[PDB]
Ligand binder design. Structure first.
Ligand SMILES: C=CC(=O)Nc1cccc(Oc2nc(Nc3ccc(N4CCN(C)CC4)cc3OC)ncc2Cl)c1
Length: 314
């Protein structure tokens, strides 16, 4: 008994969009950086195209991802522009130039400011909170999953795992980000996500260090029971770490709600220096020119517009 889903699904012709380069290869599918032009639009929008090939088993997963992505719209949640029904179904999405946050943090670990990390934490919370609002449980929150539209702006992604809160329900599951209740009982909840959220913040705070490094996955479930947990990061103040710790509490109801996380981090954002300690944050900067876009896609960019401006969803 739920409200009807009226989300609009858009079908896009292959002729309209041309792939430029490959971001990653899944063997099953690869994602290509690309430019999409609507016919008689006189606009070019940067997008990423995902290819499943044509194995029948594969398609249901491919489309399911499409069904969830189409349904949800938020600034901090990744946007699906449409799909193309070619011999192999193609998924078209807004392109984040700077890529996954997890990679980004590592590239720029020296140059990343105190303010940015706190701001990223708020952005992630907003996006997750909205999903919670939608009653959609991500089921897989990770640093790699979050993507950077710009250093200032980041959005969530990888919804294939994601399932509705109501619903009862190679072959790889990441234990480390998974909440304890989930690991023992395969239980997933928004509260479950928060635990996933805490790890993600740990990744940012630790600048992409792998969690529980050198630890067998099998071991971890036991370790959690003891109450052992990830170490406080060097940069982190107690105020920040405690917030992370609360996420990891065994009793889910106890873990901080997402809306609170936005609030707690936002206050911290006002005075970044006080909460997080890093050497010379005050004199650090990171990257918007059309010419740069030309560098990105090696093409004239006079008419280029981004999906957010163009999509104007709603
Ligand atoms: C699981 C980590 C990961 O690489 N995820 C990933 C990788 C490639 C593409 C991807 O999906 C997207 N990626 C992007 N942007 C993007 C992603 C990764 C990258 N890189 C940049 C080069 N790096 C070595 C590999 C990943 C670059 C991107 O924009 C230039 N935009 C939209 C989507 Cl849907 C996710």
């Amino acid at each position: 008994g739920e409200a009807p889903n009226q989300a609009l699904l858009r079908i896009l012709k292959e002729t309209e969009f041309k792939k430029i380069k490959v971001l990653g290869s899944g063997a099953f599918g690869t994602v290509y950086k690309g430019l999409w032009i609507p016919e008689g639009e006189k606009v070019k929008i940067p997008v990423a195209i995902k290819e499943l090939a044509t194995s029948p088993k594969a398609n249901k997963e491919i489309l399911d991802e499409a069904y969830v992505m189409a349904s949800v719209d938020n600034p901090h949640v990744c946007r699906l522009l449409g799909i193309c029904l070619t011999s192999t179904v193609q998924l078209i999405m807004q392109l984040m130039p700077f890529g996954c946050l997890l990679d980004y943090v590592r590239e720029h670990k020296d140059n990343i400011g105190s303010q940015y990390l706190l701001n990223w934490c708020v952005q992630i919370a907003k996006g997750m909170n909205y999903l919670e609002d939608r009653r959609l449980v991500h089921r897989d929150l990770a640093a790699r999953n979050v993507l950077v539209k710009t250093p200032q702006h980041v959005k969530i992604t990888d919804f294939g795992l994601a399932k509705l809160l109501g619903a009862e329900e190679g072959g790889k599951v990441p234990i480390k980000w998974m909440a304890l209740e989930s690991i023992l009982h395969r239980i997933y909840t928004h509260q479950s996500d928060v635990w996933s959220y805490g790890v993600t913040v740990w990744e940012l705070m630790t600048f992409g260090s792998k969690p529980y490094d050198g630890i067998p996955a099998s071991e971890i479930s036991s370790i959690l029971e003891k109450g052992e947990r990830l170490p406080q990061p060097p940069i982190c103040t107690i105020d920040v770490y405690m917030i992370m710790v609360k996420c990891w509490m065994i009793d889910a109801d106890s873990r901080p709600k997402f809306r609170e996380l936005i609030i707690e981090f936002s206050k911290m954002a006002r005075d970044p220096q006080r909460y997080l300690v890093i050497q010379g944050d005050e004199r650090m900067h990171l990257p918007d020119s059309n010419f740069y876009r030309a560098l990105m896609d090696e093409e004239d960019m006079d008419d280029v517009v981004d999906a957010d401006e163009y999509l104007i969803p709603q």
